[PDB]
Amino acid sequence: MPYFVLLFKILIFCVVAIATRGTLPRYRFDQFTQLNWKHFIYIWLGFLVFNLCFVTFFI
Amino acid sequence: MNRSIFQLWKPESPRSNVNSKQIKTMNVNFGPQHPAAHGVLRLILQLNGEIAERFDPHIGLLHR
Amino acid sequence: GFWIAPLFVNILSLPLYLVMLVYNIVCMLLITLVIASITLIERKVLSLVQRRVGPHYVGYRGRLQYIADALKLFIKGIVVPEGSNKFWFVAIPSAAGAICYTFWINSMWGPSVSIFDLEYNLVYATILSILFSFCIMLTGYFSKSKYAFMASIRCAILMLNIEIFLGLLVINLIFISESFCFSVFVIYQEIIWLIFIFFGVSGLIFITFLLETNRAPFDLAEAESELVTGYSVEYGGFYFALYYLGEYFHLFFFSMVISIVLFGGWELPNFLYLFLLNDFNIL
Amino acid sequence: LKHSATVLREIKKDTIMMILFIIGGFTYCYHMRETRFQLDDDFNEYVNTNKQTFRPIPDHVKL
Amino acid sequence: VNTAYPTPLKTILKTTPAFVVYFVFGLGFSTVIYDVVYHPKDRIERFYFRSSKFERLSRKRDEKLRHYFKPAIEWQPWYNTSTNNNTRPLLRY
Amino acid sequence: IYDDYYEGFNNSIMNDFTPLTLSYYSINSAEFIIIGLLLLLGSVACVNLYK
Amino acid sequence: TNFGSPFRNTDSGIVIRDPENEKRLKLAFQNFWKSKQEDKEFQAQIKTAVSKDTVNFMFYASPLFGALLGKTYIDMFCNPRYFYFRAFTLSMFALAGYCVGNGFRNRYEHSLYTRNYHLFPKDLQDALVNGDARYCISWWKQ
Amino acid sequence: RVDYIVTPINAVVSWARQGSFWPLTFGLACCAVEMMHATVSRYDFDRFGVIFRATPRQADLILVAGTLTNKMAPGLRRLYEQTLDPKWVLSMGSCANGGGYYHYSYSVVRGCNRIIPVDIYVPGCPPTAEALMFGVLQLQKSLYRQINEGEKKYNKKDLTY
Amino acid sequence: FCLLFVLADAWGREKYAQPYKSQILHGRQPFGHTFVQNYRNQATDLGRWNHNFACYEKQPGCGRDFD
Amino acid sequence: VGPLNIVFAGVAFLMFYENNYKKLYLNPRYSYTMPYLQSAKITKNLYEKL
Amino acid sequence: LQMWGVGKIIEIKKFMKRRDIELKGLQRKAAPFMQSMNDVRHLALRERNDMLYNELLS
Amino acid sequence: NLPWFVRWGTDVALFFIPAYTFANYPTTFFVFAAEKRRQRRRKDFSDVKLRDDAAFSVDQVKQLQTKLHLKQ
Amino acid sequence: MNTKSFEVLIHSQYAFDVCREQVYNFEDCRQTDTPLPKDPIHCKAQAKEVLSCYKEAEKMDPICLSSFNDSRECMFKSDGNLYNCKTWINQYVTCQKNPAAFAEFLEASTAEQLKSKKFDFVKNRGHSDKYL
Amino acid sequence: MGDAVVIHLIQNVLIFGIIFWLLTWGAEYFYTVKQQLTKKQFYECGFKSISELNIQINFNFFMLAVFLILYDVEFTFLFPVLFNFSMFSTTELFLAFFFIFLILVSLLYDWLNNVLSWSA
Ligand SMILES: CCCCCCCCCCCCCCCCCC(=O)OC[C@H](COP(=O)([O-])OCC[N+](C)(C)C)OC(=O)CCCCCCCCCCCCCCCCC
Ligand code: SF4
Structure with a gap:
């Protein structure tokens, strides 16, 4: 059944999250809010526009 | 960018309500039992939106 | 009998409700055991990264560490600070426990293999995340501890970024699947996983995954070094156990969501043999 | 950064290769779209085999 | 001759008991969900919204006929319950 | 109980957003653009009110 | 296969893994092609999106084009004393070229058995659409 | 006849509390540094389940590892009082035990046992990480045994009354 | 830049057949859209409506059913 | 108890019994609404009395 | 990769559209008889209502 | 005597084969009941209407299916 | 009229080739200039004629029982997806059109084709199934 | 979106919480809490x-909060066209791109005036 492979992928992602917790430092709320509202939101919107343009290219 | 100095600092004028601290300051203490206080520092920390405004470091809790 | 039969309709339907309750209780117990095993896995993986054995003397070679942790959190006594509102101090953990055990209803394990026929899984996930954020904020506020309240404020600030980030990720995701259901994402990932399209925003996907699960670098509202403990400064015993369980439930189920919507769902990796795979098999 | 001549040559190499790679990717996407058009044509030819009947609208339906 | 495991393999292998117990619990949970869905339908009923409109009409036509058409076509003025616990309309208005 | 099977098999719609699309992007598109301009001007006015 | 047959869902609810049926179907269609190989009008009626010569040229040139691109890539960017990675990159480029060529060939087959679907007899059409060789027993039995 | 149930559950509760002994992240001095050394890879407290919690509400063990001054004694007393029950106390180091080097000082409590009750004492200055682990393991064994030390006598049917 | 590129490609797709011309410049929408936006429309002038097959008589491939 | 309380109990029992009676015996019992009172057989035709 | 993945997703959607064309043909073959059954049952339930209305309102 | 990968292969096999079987058969010890229900769902000749101008009678069809070893 | 929905779909897939005149008359009677359907009261005679021809077309040949059962099982497990079961439905309709020819069809079967058909649309999903 | 079965599952979750409550009470059997002056007071690192x-x-x-409100509204407005983008036309494409452009313009104006940071 598919949930076997699904559980494998879930375990992989959980291990990745645990390793990242053990690896990376901690951001600041102001720092990440500035990063999200000045860089990442624009990246998301531009990627959405790119996807729309590509879909219109391929119909 | 443009200028944002007025958004960066807030001075106090005599008897000026707007220039005064129009808020109850969060006078929490970075007390001893704190992972970042090394256990023997009582830093009376006056904060304004988690911004460290005033410091009163009580030391001597390990004075021997 | 012809005259005794009418009286028994409802009292005969009641055992079916009892059976449904038993099934739901079994499912909740199993998912709680999954969460406990995930906690043990996290301890062992952090042990691997930090070059230490980890849990090794609870059970034989540390097999029953999670059971011991859960039972200890049961046995730990709880006192409500007399300066705090007792009603809210006890109710907010109960609401968090109720909400965190609604996560497993919004989970797909195959094509239309789920407890309910939820067409709006992403909407349900958003609603449950917002409700748990409400619980965290009120936990910080009603404890009347300054560190806990600052942790609640940090949690609120996260939801400002969490909402935008997750909403834009969903906006970019539902553009392909054209549905909030998780199976519709999987039907498009049999050839190539959707991570291929979003490879340019793979860093942002990592940010979203670590941000919805409140793991580092977005472990804000916990801030072990900065705010002492997180929102649970005044909470011990099974209230803290409920908060920990809610965090790990969110981690597990958002990992499932990410796997379903971006990493093939429940499909084996077929892009590794993409160069050797044909399009059609005619005749 | 005052890069050496070797570093400048490497930068030129990688930027030229990137431009050529982007152009080749766009050309291959054009080809892939054309192949999709061909597949659609093939399937239309298949599916319109025994569906050549066109029934006129009855005269009781007005303009 | 010492045929022992590679050291990186050993180090990463002192997590596989936890991996196995997680897999056992997760397989149990998923199997219980699957069986709870499977038992009433004797199958895995594909979701209603995962079907085309004609398919949706065909799937629920028998339920419509058995639960609403037969009571409506065999209705008598004395069949309705004197209380307000009647059958709710298909479209709640 | 009446079901129009001809319209059912002639219907390719697979989501409930069709009226919303037909509104905000076909007929009420004027009010959609008006609401977009309204939100833009409201953000500008919010910035000015903060200042 | 990525998409399977365009006429059916290849493994919808049951996996059919009969090699004999596939051999019978291939033999039946081979016999059909051989029977009308000398029919000039039927050959004139055969239509395809891509010609056989173009398909063969793409199938035998895309791997070569990919190999040349991989050689260029490993000469420009790879240190020439690292056999494992240089060979892996060259093999990946060659496999990408082979993927392009095999896609060309498979699309040729798809266009062959769909554009000319109206030229098959009724039993052959049924066998092709349903994937069951029992629909045309007179083309593979003897 | 209630002793039939509680005694196995007594054992289960003792095993659970010894398998999840969470001490409070509260250190003062060189003893606190050695305590931190007793957590890292070489001596892994996570093997026995000892993981540090930052708040006394979530801590079972109060590890007084450092010098207690007259400016800190009310703080230690409040930390002990606010720790949720059941709780145990480990005094690590000569300063915590009886003052140690600063026993003849004007601003030293001369032992944390004068302020809060101490369950177990580790003598070194600083105790080695092995000594601290020995103290923690002995405390875990004792608290496992403390739930049933044989206080209740046995009747003619060998059931505790 | 991507928007300009896709618009230029869409205008360059006029060389293809009608089913494969750009959907940007050629509306291909479900039957409800087709009927409502073209009913009593003299600009398109699609003629009568085939109720069973949900298409206008002048639209290509309308009323196509099995032989 | 009380007179009006007994009257209420009688009327409520009458409502309960009448509702269940009309569910059981005045109804096309083709839809499974009452477990353990309707049959659990697997039907073959469209209309089979449960 | 983004452009190629969008192209592949569009190819999958077009293949699904071809399958939808075939399925719609099958449903069209199935349409008239289901519609006839539905219309007959609908008019049977309308004849009873018309008779009831004519008896009550007369 | 045995290489490490052979010794490691035993443990991964012991993890995978039971887990793979359990995932393949969620309804443990009830697949036989499901098969019996599927067999009972098959309509027989009496459960369906049969045309009178039949090329093969019911007995002929049964004999043909027995000859062909059709499991149905 | 007493037949379940999926069996009605299968019998209609067969009967569309033999009820052609009745279906055409019913469709011409129900045509209109709007996607809104015509009142069924105007098409009652044609609908009843179609139902009569369909009932006459529901009497399957005895040799087609196995194919009909396979189609029923596929439609049950697929929750009414005709495309996922077009192969078995086509087998049934080919049996109905010519039974003896279908006897020859069955005689030339393989070992895999002679096994019982068990359907599991979760374990086996196909390739790019939109409705799944 | 669920139904009465979801409501009943919420009830079952409440019953599961009742089970946890029973376990917690049984655990409460196994200890005694002694009243103390500062035991039930606020914790502020020992003082x-x-x-x-x-x-x-x-x-x-x-x-940031008010911009979150506005942009959440805008994303909700963007949802329908993306759900049914396969039927897009010139009008729908123009409207979607213009709406995204307006969102980007609003964000850029917010950036220009330094209102996306903290203030004193
Ligand atoms: C302080 C409020 C700030 C704004 C809150 C905005 C909404 C936040 C929503 C998130 C959850 C909040 C806590 C929920 C639990 C407490 C309920 C509450 O406030 O009761 C007040 C009410 C009223 O409180 P009261 O009695 O103090 O008010 C009387 C009015 N005064 C005091 C002003 C005169 O409490 C009760 O009625 C108590 C008994 C019923 C309790 C019911 C809830 C218990 C928990 C059950 C599970 C809940 C989650 C279910 C999840 C299902 C799946 C999603
Ligand atoms: S006992 Fe010794 S090591 Fe410990 S705090 Fe005192 S001086 Fe430092």
Whole structure:
């Protein structure tokens, strides 16, 4: 059944999250809010526009 | 960018309500039992939106 | 009998409700055991990264560490600070426990293999995340501890970024699947996983995954070094156990969501043999 | 950064290769779209085999 | 001759008991969900919204006929319950 | 109980957003653009009110 | 296969893994092609999106084009004393070229058995659409 | 006849509390540094389940590892009082035990046992990480045994009354 | 830049057949859209409506059913 | 108890019994609404009395 | 990769559209008889209502 | 005597084969009941209407299916 | 009229080739200039004629029982997806059109084709199934 | 979106919480809590807190909150066209791109005036 492979992928992602917790430092709320509202939101919107343009290219 | 100095600092004028601290300051203490206080520092920390405004470091809790 | 039969309709339907309750209780117990095993896995993986054995003397070679942790959190006594509102101090953990055990209803394990026929899984996930954020904020506020309240404020600030980030990720995701259901994402990932399209925003996907699960670098509202403990400064015993369980439930189920919507769902990796795979098999 | 001549040559190499790679990717996407058009044509030819009947609208339906 | 495991393999292998117990619990949970869905339908009923409109009409036509058409076509003025616990309309208005 | 099977098999719609699309992007598109301009001007006015 | 047959869902609810049926179907269609190989009008009626010569040229040139691109890539960017990675990159480029060529060939087959679907007899059409060789027993039995 | 149930559950509760002994992240001095050394890879407290919690509400063990001054004694007393029950106390180091080097000082409590009750004492200055682990393991064994030390006598049917 | 590129490609797709011309410049929408936006429309002038097959008589491939 | 309380109990029992009676015996019992009172057989035709 | 993945997703959607064309043909073959059954049952339930209305309102 | 990968292969096999079987058969010890229900769902000749101008009678069809070893 | 929905779909897939005149008359009677359907009261005679021809077309040949059962099982497990079961439905309709020819069809079967058909649309999903 | 079965599952979750409550009470059998002066007081790292109810925040991110409201509304408005983008036409494409452009313009104006940071 598919949930076997699904559980494998879930375990992989959980291990990745645990390793990242053990690896990376901690951001600041102001720092990440500035990063999200000045860089990442624009990246998301531009990627959405790119996807729309590509879909219109391929119909 | 443009200028944002007025958004960066807030001075106090005599008897000026707007220039005064129009808020109850969060006078929490970075007390001893704190992972970042090394256990023997009582830093009376006056904060304004988690911004460290005033410091009163009580030391001597390990004075021997 | 012809005259005794009418009286028994409802009292005969009641055992079916009892059976449904038993099934739901079994499912909740199993998912709680999954969460406990995930906690043990996290301890062992952090042990691997930090070059230490980890849990090794609870059970034989540390097999029953999670059971011991859960039972200890049961046995730990709880006192409500007399300066705090007792009603809210006890109710907010109960609401968090109720909400965190609604996560497993919004989970797909195959094509239309789920407890309910939820067409709006992403909407349900958003609603449950917002409700748990409400619980965290009120936990910080009603404890009347300054560190806990600052942790609640940090949690609120996260939801400002969490909402935008997750909403834009969903906006970019539902553009392909054209549905909030998780199976519709999987039907498009049999050839190539959707991570291929979003490879340019793979860093942002990592940010979203670590941000919805409140793991580092977005472990804000916990801030072990900065705010002492997180929102649970005044909470011990099974209230803290409920908060920990809610965090790990969110981690597990958002990992499932990410796997379903971006990493093939429940499909084996077929892009590794993409160069050797044909399009059609005619005749 | 005052890069050496070797570093400048490497930068030129990688930027030229990137431009050529982007152009080749766009050309291959054009080809892939054309192949999709061909597949659609093939399937239309298949599916319109025994569906050549066109029934006129009855005269009781007005303009 | 010492045929022992590679050291990186050993180090990463002192997590596989936890991996196995997680897999056992997760397989149990998923199997219980699957069986709870499977038992009433004797199958895995594909979701209603995962079907085309004609398919949706065909799937629920028998339920419509058995639960609403037969009571409506065999209705008598004395069949309705004197209380307000009647059958709710298909479209709640 | 009446079901129009001809319209059912002639219907390719697979989501409930069709009226919303037909509104905000076909007929009420004027009010959609008006609401977009309204939100833009409201953000500008919010910035000015903060200042 | 990525998409399977365009006429059916290849493994919808049951996996059919009969090699004999596939051999019978291939033999039946081979016999059909051989029977009308000398029919000039039927050959004139055969239509395809891509010609056989173009398909063969793409199938035998895309791997070569990919190999040349991989050689260029490993000469420009790879240190020439690292056999494992240089060979892996060259093999990946060659496999990408082979993927392009095999896609060309498979699309040729798809266009062959769909554009000319109206030229098959009724039993052959049924066998092709349903994937069951029992629909045309007179083309593979003897 | 209630002793039939509680005694196995007594054992289960003792095993659970010894398998999840969470001490409070509260250190003062060189003893606190050695305590931190007793957590890292070489001596892994996570093997026995000892993981540090930052708040006394979530801590079972109060590890007084450092010098207690007259400016800190009310703080230690409040930390002990606010720790949720059941709780145990480990005094690590000569300063915590009886003052140690600063026993003849004007601003030293001369032992944390004068302020809060101490369950177990580790003598070194600083105790080695092995000594601290020995103290923690002995405390875990004792608290496992403390739930049933044989206080209740046995009747003619060998059931505790 | 991507928007300009896709618009230029869409205008360059006029060389293809009608089913494969750009959907940007050629509306291909479900039957409800087709009927409502073209009913009593003299600009398109699609003629009568085939109720069973949900298409206008002048639209290509309308009323196509099995032989 | 009380007179009006007994009257209420009688009327409520009458409502309960009448509702269940009309569910059981005045109804096309083709839809499974009452477990353990309707049959659990697997039907073959469209209309089979449960 | 983004452009190629969008192209592949569009190819999958077009293949699904071809399958939808075939399925719609099958449903069209199935349409008239289901519609006839539905219309007959609908008019049977309308004849009873018309008779009831004519008896009550007369 | 045995290489490490052979010794490691035993443990991964012991993890995978039971887990793979359990995932393949969620309804443990009830697949036989499901098969019996599927067999009972098959309509027989009496459960369906049969045309009178039949090329093969019911007995002929049964004999043909027995000859062909059709499991149905 | 007493037949379940999926069996009605299968019998209609067969009967569309033999009820052609009745279906055409019913469709011409129900045509209109709007996607809104015509009142069924105007098409009652044609609908009843179609139902009569369909009932006459529901009497399957005895040799087609196995194919009909396979189609029923596929439609049950697929929750009414005709495309996922077009192969078995086509087998049934080919049996109905010519039974003896279908006897020859069955005689030339393989070992895999002679096994019982068990359907599991979760374990086996196909390739790019939109409705799944 | 669920139904009465979802409501019944919420009830079952409440019953599961009741089970956890029973376990917690049974655990409460196994210890005694001794009344102490500061045991039920606020914890502020070992010293008495100087405030109980008046713990006020500064809320320097109210601009971020209001922009979150507006942009969540905008994304909700963007949802329908993306759900049914396969049927897009010239009008729908123009409207979607113009709406995204307006969102980007609003964000850029917010950036220009330095209202996306903290204030004193
Ligand atoms: C302080 C409020 C700030 C704004 C809150 C905005 C909404 C936040 C929503 C998130 C959850 C909040 C806590 C929920 C639990 C407490 C309920 C509450 O406030 O009761 C007040 C009410 C009223 O409180 P009261 O009695 O103090 O009010 C009387 C009015 N005064 C005091 C002003 C005169 O409490 C009760 O009625 C108590 C008994 C019923 C309790 C019911 C809830 C218990 C928990 C059950 C599970 C809940 C989650 C279910 C999840 C299902 C799946 C999603
Ligand atoms: S006992 Fe010794 S090592 Fe410990 S705090 Fe005192 S001086 Fe330092």
